[PDB]
Ligand binder design. Structure first.
Ligand code: PEE
Ligand code: PEE
Ligand code: HEM
Ligand code: HEM
Ligand code: HEM
Ligand code: JZV
Lengths: 55, 101, 422, 49, 59, 271, 442, 54
């Protein structure tokens, strides 16, 4: 298909186009750091949530 | 008297894009009209704008600004796009008006 | 109520000629005829005339690209530009009640273009398209090469922007071309379906790019070359000519007649042309399908005459020879006093029919009012045509057999003869 | 050549009213559509219920 | 011809088609339920409380 | 970036509902009374009011049936948040990120990795430190002691107030004395976010070069701290009058002043 | 003024010869003229075995008559500077001549000689046999016509109108001197013909010359009877001729039209003017008034497209045809059908207002010259049984309004099963069902 | 893009998997189980939640 398997694969391609080869402005500041924190925050709530739910 | 001029020149300096070496028109949000106008700019004006903007993005990431000497002065700011943009809007309004009739 | 009106024709101080004829038709057709075309182009600005042709709909000082099209279409009108290597006509059609409306755009397009760089830039790739459909007719490729082989300049210039120049024409060249050619002394404002006073009040109190004759075209030098194009086509199109007659020239009528005598176009659907010596001659020569006609063009300072032949590759040899023998055979008194009589009629008929068309009429009228300033009555043109001796015709033919020929052919020329083999 | 091409006969499938090649098929069109659409509208009513 | 009338009045314009479905469903429900219940009770005569209720219904 | 924005507003709303139902689960005093106070607000909606409420509770008051359905909702919504977050980023990727100068960054783009993966990981540890410091050294700093007492429907706590992140809205709720009006005001305090895209008048995208808007912006921020503060206070003078001032200025700044100052600024740039 | 110029148009004179032939003309002050006979005959009148006869007869019509063989006939027409031409369609045939008004009478004699005395030389027939067979291979490469043939082949499948004008390969390889004779003797008859003329000609001298060469009178009542053709049934269906090797695809879609007589045709034509047409050389480009044209330009939807309202005695085809690249067929079709739905549901007075002016110009432009004025007279008589003056057409065209275009279009287009013909690399255009759905809800 | 079914970042997804999605013309009833499995899943989740609430 394509040279590197990061672009051809139907899934890695997704991971690559949103977390690796994804074009980002060179000047975004710390204020743009909150999106990722929100996501991580969400994964953490869900994780600790499940652990609490089990009791 | 020269009140409107005092205010403008004041706002111009308060805004501060001139510290990045940008022209007022460099700072325009690129909606549709502005996008069309840009396509009409002569090559030289377009490349100068591009460098100015790239230069500003680099200062921005560095958290620096240009030395005071290199700041664009109120009266030397070239409104390079305003002319094209006004025409683009004039054309749009003509078509809009005409398509209603 | 309406009746017989008469074809008036003023001429303003600046030399701007205004022709006019009211035939009370429900529709009008006004036009601006101009002495301009690829003829005035230089190696430096080739194609500019072509691009100008396609640029008629671009924004002008008085109307915008958007209003020009929407405006004209709002009243079911039309706007088009036809042109030759030396004349450009900008005309509009519409119902009588909309002339005044459609007129604004015609006026604007021809006298106030803006040739905005961007508009011009987006337009140029169109030269590639426009030219692509035109060249679908082999008929067009050889004529381009014919004029290129027949001349060294002016007329040698192609009617369609050459490839290498697509996208390189500039707004400066368009403006300069228009400023140096679209001048009142080179323009005529013809107009069928309108009252002369009206069409005149327009021409004056409105047209502004003016005075003089600007750029003058270099004389049409004659080269006499032979351009061949091997392209595979099962059919070979070939055209062999010689310096013919100029327009307004007495020697014209002679050729026009030798044209019909030799045969120029069929008059009977799917029919054979007996009254065509040329066709008939070739017919006896080849066995397979083909076609052959008398070619004749009359330009301001020159003209071309000869024959044009379409035939299967393998038989181009026999077909072209035949067309030739039939020309020599005519130059050697092979022309009956009757052939000259038949022709003269076909010519007068063809002429008369070629004016029933609103387009055909305006063209006829305007052509004179520009390269003359008068309207030769139909009886006069008739008087001039039949007043052509059987000798004149045999002479015209001589002029061909003797003159230096230039040839243009294209197809699988594998069996097509060279100019020096005829 | 295309002149030699013709549409096969659909008599084995045509509905009764458009079976005859010399009758206008429009006259029975509201009938044929009305029926099929009636089936459909009824399914919608059955489903909405 | 009902099929044609139907088509013209009800099924042609998408708006009326939806109106026909709604008004159609309202009427279908009322009818279909009455019938179903009717069928069910008939198939179970004297077994439902609705049937024996009178025996103790008497304040 | 309208769609990225609207999905964003939806994420916020879903997040709030999630935390609301979550808070009820421990079934302490504030759990129960917060549930009561807020859900009773809907009985104020016309005609369908009382219905909607008794439907939500699954009875005549916040009780076991409410608790069990709230657990189900709490377990569920976070997954909707994850889902919608994907849509959020999907719309976002149509345009790519905006930047602090508000001008096209096509002339200067860099790959997300390693630049931002590193910047973000750093950002993560920088925030995560105060988080853990609080959770490990001052666990109950933000919570209400009242929640260390089992819910009791026969004892109303003196000061029924929410977790800090809802205070600003609670203040606005209480600013309009009139069950129905307050509810609408509360609703509007967050739904107002859906109008922001339509109140942009500036010729420039960001506020980086708009000093008047910048102060208006910080005025608004301070406005929010004030509402948060009013939200934690009892309903008495002077907190009552201050509260309405803050609620009023809140809506004014977003609805009237921002768009107005933007236009004004356009003129000062001779636009 | 326009209104007046219309009135001052010389009337069209029509008089009937007792043998059934009708003579009509519009006298102008022109030195040149056009006269010919328009016959109500064509492939629709043919049957499965003589299909192509009328076309075969068109090939001989000029190869000489009995009174004067090939060479002589051609030489006589050529030498007077006259142009002899004609055609043959599904329901109409014609042979006409362009010459000087002076020769009007000799012309009429020539005409009458052609339709009445075709030589039908046995040797000629075997020659035109090979010629027609080649014209078939040539025409086979004109996608536009291959497509309209297919459109008829399916729209009117199983009927007369389903046939091509040129006929089959079999019919042409075997048609006989007899069949050709039979066709002529069966169809070219006075009551079914019209001698029309336009230019500088006296209706009188015309009809006088008419009685003289168009004498053949009828005895029985049958001979004075114009036969009514069996109606052709329309079928919503599609034919897909796929050849990915072809550079561009052609698509034609149409619903059944009302047929000549019906007044709605005036509205339909007004409707077609709203959508209009396009081709990559229209300078107007993205500013064209036609919405479909604009989209076509903006999105590069096609190389060209045209709307049409083809009429016939008892029926017709109302639709459109476009040429597009393999990968833009779907979007083109989408917008196209879209515009039809706009016609039925949201036409504006501004649109019709403009559509009318375009239509007026169109009708006027159809009478630009003698040949075209003659074609109109020949056709009008044969189809309307009279001449409809531009002054009338204009009256009708002016009565059209938004409301009317919507009702008429809804009446012929909305929720109808269309006829679809597609030729070329058509894989992206697909499913009759999907297309059928494009037939309702704007 | 002409129709909003293809341009829109979401409808485009709905269209490329449930409307303009190219499917073989001859797949039988055995291919009906994928969709049933999906619907089945939506239903279990729905009735599941309703039960979980009690
Ligand atoms: C008392 C109840 C009254 C209130 C109920 C309100 C519901 C009303 C619904 C609105 C009306 C629908 C409007 C439809 C219009 C759109 C349309 O074109 O028709 C649908 C269209 C048909 O196309 P055409 O035949 O070409 O029609 C062309 C018309 N000229 O699409 C369809 O096939 C849809 C109809 C079939 C439905 C199939 C559903 C099968 C499901 C069965 C299982 C049961 C349901 C359980 C639901 C689970 C909920 C948790
Ligand atoms: C909402 C709920 C309310 C809860 C309370 C709100 C949060 C209170 C905490 C205070 C926020 C701390 C931020 C202090 C940082 C100060 C600072 O750096 O400001 C200057 C600096 C200058 O930037 P440029 O103009 O681009 O300069 C480029 C050239 N050098 O400005 C910025 O960093 C941009 C400000 C963005 C962060 C805003 C954070 C406050 C959050 C509140 C939400 C308010 C909005 C509406 C919500 C309604 C619901
Ligand atoms: C669970 C909540 C949310 C998650 C997980 C989330 C995640 C993200 C991520 C990962 C980004 C890219 C990085 C960044 O610029 O920060 C982003 C950008 C963005 N989000 Fe969110 N977001 C959330 C809530 C919201 C809310 C509530 C809004 C607005 C009311 C919003 C508006 C935006 C917008 C407009 C962008 C564009 C940023 C730019 O200007 O470049 N998001 N979000
Ligand atoms: C969007 C992420 C979530 C948010 C914002 C959130 C919020 C909350 C809040 C505010 C509480 C009350 C905490 C307290 O003061 O005691 C809570 C409790 C709880 N949450 Fe979540 N939660 C989230 C996700 C989850 C998930 C995914 C689950 C598990 C499927 C979960 C399970 C619980 C449980 C069992 C409790 C009760 C125990 C306790 O009170 O500590 N949470 N949650
Ligand atoms: C993949 C879909 C699911 C499958 C295959 C499934 C299967 C089952 C099975 C086999 C039982 C036992 C039923 C019995 O005999 O009583 C059950 C019970 C139950 N399921 Fe699910 N379930 C599914 C999804 C869910 C979901 C999404 C929920 C709710 C969040 C849920 C909630 C429950 C509850 C509360 C019960 C207990 C009540 C009862 O037994 O009827 N289930 N499920
Ligand atoms: C179940 O109550 N949970 C409370 C809490 O603090 O959870 C963190 C609480 C506590 C005390 C008072 C009011 C509230 C309820 O929340 N208060 C408000 C005022 C609110 C405001 C806006 C939206 C929402 C909602 F519904 F989450 F969407 C709620």
């Amino acid at each position: 298909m394509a040279p590197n398997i990061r672009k051809s694969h139907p899934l890695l391609k997704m991971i690559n186009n949103s977390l690796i080869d994804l074009p980002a402005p060179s000047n975004i500041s710390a204020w743009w750091n909150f999106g990722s924190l929100l996501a991580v925050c969400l994964m953490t709530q869900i994780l600790t949530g499940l652990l609490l739910a089990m009791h | 008297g020269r009140l409107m001029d005092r205010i403008r020149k004041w706002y111009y300096n308060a805004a501060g894009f001139n510290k990045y070496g940008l022209m007022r028109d460099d700072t325009l949000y690129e909606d549709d009209d502005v996008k069309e106008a840009l396509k009409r700019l002569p090559e030289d004006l377009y490349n100068e704008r591009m460098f100015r903007i790239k230069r500003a993005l680099d200062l921005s990431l560095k958290h620096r600004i240009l030395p005071k000497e290199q700041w664009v002065k109120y009266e030397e700011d070239k409104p390079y796009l305003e002319p094209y943009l006004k025409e683009v809007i004039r054309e749009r309004l003509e078509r809009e008006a005409w398509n209603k009739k | 109520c309406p009746g017989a009106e008469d074809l008036e024709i003023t001429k303003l101080p600046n030399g701007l000629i205004i022709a006019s004829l009211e035939n009370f038709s429900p529709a009008s057709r006004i036009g601006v005829f101009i002495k301009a075309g690829s003829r005035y182009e230089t190696t430096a600005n080739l194609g500019t005339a072509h691009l100008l042709r396609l640029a008629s709909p671009l924004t002008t000082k008085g109307a915008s690209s958007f209003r020009i099209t929407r405006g004209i279409e709002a009243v079911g009108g039309s706007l088009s530009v036809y042109s030759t290597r030396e004349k450009m006509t900008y005309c509009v059609e519409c119902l009588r009640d909309h002339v005044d409306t459609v007129m604004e755009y015609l006026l604007n397009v021809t006298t106030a273009p803006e040739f905005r760089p961007w508009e011009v830039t987006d337009l140029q790739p169109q030269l590639k398209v426009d030219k692509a459909v035109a060249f679908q007719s082999p008929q067009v490729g050889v004529l381009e090469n014919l004029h290129a082989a027949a001349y060294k300049t002016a007329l040698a210039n192609p009617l369609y922007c050459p490839d290498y120049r697509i996208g390189k024409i500039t707004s400066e060249q368009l403006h300069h071309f228009v400023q140096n050619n679209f001048t009142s002394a080179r323009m005529a404002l013809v107009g069928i379906g309108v009252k002369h006073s009206d069409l005149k009040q327009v021409a004056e109190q409105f047209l502004n790019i003016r005075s003089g004759a600007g750029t003058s075209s270099a004389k049409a030098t004659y080269w006499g070359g032979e351009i061949r194009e091997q392209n595979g086509h099962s059919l070979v199109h070939a055209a062999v000519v010689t310096e013919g007659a100029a327009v307004g020239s007495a020697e014209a009528n002679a050729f026009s007649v030798l044209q019909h005598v030799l045969g120029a176009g069929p008059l009977i659907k799917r029919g054979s042309s007996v009254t065509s010596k040329l066709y008939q001659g070739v017919a006896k020569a080849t066995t397979q399908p083909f076609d052959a006609s008398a070619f004749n063009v009359n330009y301001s300072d020159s003209g071309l005459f000869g024959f044009y032949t379409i035939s299967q590759a393998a038989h181009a040899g026999e077909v072209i020879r035949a067309a030739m023998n039939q020309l020599k055979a005519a130059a050697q008194g092979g022309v009956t006093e009757e052939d000259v009589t038949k022709a003269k009629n076909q010519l007068k008929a063809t002429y008369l029919m070629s004016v029933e068309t609103a387009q055909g009429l305006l063209n006829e009228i305007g052509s004179e009012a520009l390269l003359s300033g008068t309207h030769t009555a139909p009886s006069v043109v008739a008087q001039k045509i039949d007043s052509v001796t059987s000798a004149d015709v045999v002479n015209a033919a001589k002029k061909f057999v003797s003159g230096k020929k230039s040839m243009a052919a294209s197809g699988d020329l594998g069996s097509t003869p060279f100019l020096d083999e005829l | 050549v295309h002149n030699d091409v013709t549409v096969p006969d659909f008599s084995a499938y045509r509905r009764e009213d458009v079976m005859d090649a010399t009758t206008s098929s429009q006259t029975s069109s509201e009938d044929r559509k009305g029926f099929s659409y009636l089936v459909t509208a009824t399914a919608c009513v059955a489903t909405a219920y | 011809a009902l099929l044609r009338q139907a088509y013209s009045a009800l099924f042609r314009r998408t708006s009326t088609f939806a109106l026909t479905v709604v008004l159609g469903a309202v009427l279908f429900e009322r009818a279909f339920d009455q019938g179903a219940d009717a069928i069910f009770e008939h198939l179970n005569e004297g077994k439902l409380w609705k049937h024996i209720k009178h025996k103790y219904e008497a304040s | 970036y309208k769609e990225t924005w609207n999905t964003g507003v939806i994420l916020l709303l879903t997040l709030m509902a999630t935390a609301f139902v979550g808070y009820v689960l421990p079934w302490g005093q504030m759990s129960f009374w917060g549930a009561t106070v807020i859900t009773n607000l809907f009985s104020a909606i016309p005609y369908i009011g009382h219905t909607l409420v008794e439907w939500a509770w699954g009875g005549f008051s916040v009780d076991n049936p409410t608790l069990t359905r709230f657990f189900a909702l709490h377990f569920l919504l976070p997954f909707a948040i994850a889902g919608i977050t994907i849509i959020h980023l999907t719309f976002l990727h149509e345009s790519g990120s905006n930047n602090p100068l508000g001008i096209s960054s096509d002339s200067d783009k860099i790959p997300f990795h390693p630049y931002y993966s590193f910047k973000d990981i750093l950002g993560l540890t920088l925030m995560l430190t105060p988080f853990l410091t609080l959770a490990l050294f001052s666990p109950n700093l933000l919570g209400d002691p009242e929640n260390f007492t089992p819910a009791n429907p026969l004892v109303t706590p003196p000061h029924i107030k929410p977790e800090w992140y809802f205070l600003f809205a609670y203040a606005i709720l209480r600013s309009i004395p009139n069950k129905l009006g307050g509810v609408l005001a509360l609703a509007a305090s967050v739904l107002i976010l859906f109008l922001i895209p339509f109140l942009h008048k500036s010729k420039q995208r960001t506020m980086t070069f708009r000093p008047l808007s910048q102060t208006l912006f910080w005025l608004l921020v301070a406005n929010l701290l004030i509402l948060t503060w009013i939200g934690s206070q009892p309903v008495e003078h002077p907190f009552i009058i201050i509260g309405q001032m803050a609620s009023l200025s809140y809506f004014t700044i977003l609805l009237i002043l921002f768009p107005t100052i933007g236009t004004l600024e356009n003129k000062m740039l001779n636009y | 003024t326009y209104a007046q110029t219309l009135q001052n148009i010389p009337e069209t004179n029509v008089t009937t010869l007792d043998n059934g032939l009708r003579v009509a003309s519009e006298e102008s002050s022109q030195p040149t003229c056009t006269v010919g006979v328009w016959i109500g005959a064509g492939s629709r009148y043919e049957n499965e075995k003589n299909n192509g006869a009328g076309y075969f007869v068109e090939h001989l019509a000029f190869k000489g008559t009995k009174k004067r063989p090939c060479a002589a006939f051609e030489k006589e027409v050529e030498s007077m500077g006259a142009h002899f031409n004609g055609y043959t369609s599904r329901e109409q045939t014609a042979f006409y001549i362009k010459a000087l008004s002076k020769d009007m009478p000799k012309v009429v004699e020539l005409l009458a000689d052609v339709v009445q005395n075709c030589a039908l030389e046995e040797s000629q027939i075997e020659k035109e046999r090979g010629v027609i067979l080649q014209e078939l291979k040539e025409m086979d490469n004109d996608m536009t016509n291959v497509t309209f043939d297919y459109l008829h082949a399916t729209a009117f499948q199983g009927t007369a109108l389903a046939r091509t004008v040129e006929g089959t390969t079999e019919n042409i390889k075997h048609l006989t001197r007899a069949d050709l004779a039979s066709y002529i003797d069966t169809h070219f008859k006075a009551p079914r013909m019209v001698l029309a003329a336009a230019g500088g000609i006296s209706h009188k001298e015309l009809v006088d010359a008419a009685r003289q060469h168009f004498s053949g009178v009828s005895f029985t009542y049958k001979e004075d009877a114009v036969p009514i053709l069996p109606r052709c049934r329309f079928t919503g269906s599609e034919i897909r001729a796929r050849d990915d090797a072809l550079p561009v695809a052609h698509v034609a879609l149409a619903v059944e039209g009302p047929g000549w007589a019906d007044p709605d045709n005036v509205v339909l034509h007004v409707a077609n003017a709203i959508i209009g047409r396009y081709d990559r050389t229209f300078g107007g480009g993205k500013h064209l008034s036609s919405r479909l044209a604009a989209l076509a330009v903006e999105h590069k939807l096609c190389h060209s497209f045209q709307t049409f309202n083809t009429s016939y005695s008892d029926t017709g085809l109302f639709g459109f045809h476009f040429v597009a690249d393999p990968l833009s067929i779907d979007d083109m079709m989408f917008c196209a059908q879209g515009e039809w739905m706009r016609l039925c549901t949201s036409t504006t007075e501004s649109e019709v207002k403009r559509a009318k002016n375009h239509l007026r110009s169109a009708m006027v432009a159809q009478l630009d010259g003698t040949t075209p004025v003659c074609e109109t007279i020949g056709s009008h008589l044969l189809n309307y049984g009279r001449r409809i003056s531009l002054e009338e057409w204009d009256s009708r065209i002016s009565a059209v309004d938004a409301r009317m275009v919507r009702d008429v279009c809804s009446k012929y287009i909305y929720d109808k099963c269309p006829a679809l013909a597609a030729v070329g690399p058509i894989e992206q255009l697909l499913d009759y069902n999907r297309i059928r759905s494009g037939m309702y809800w704007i």
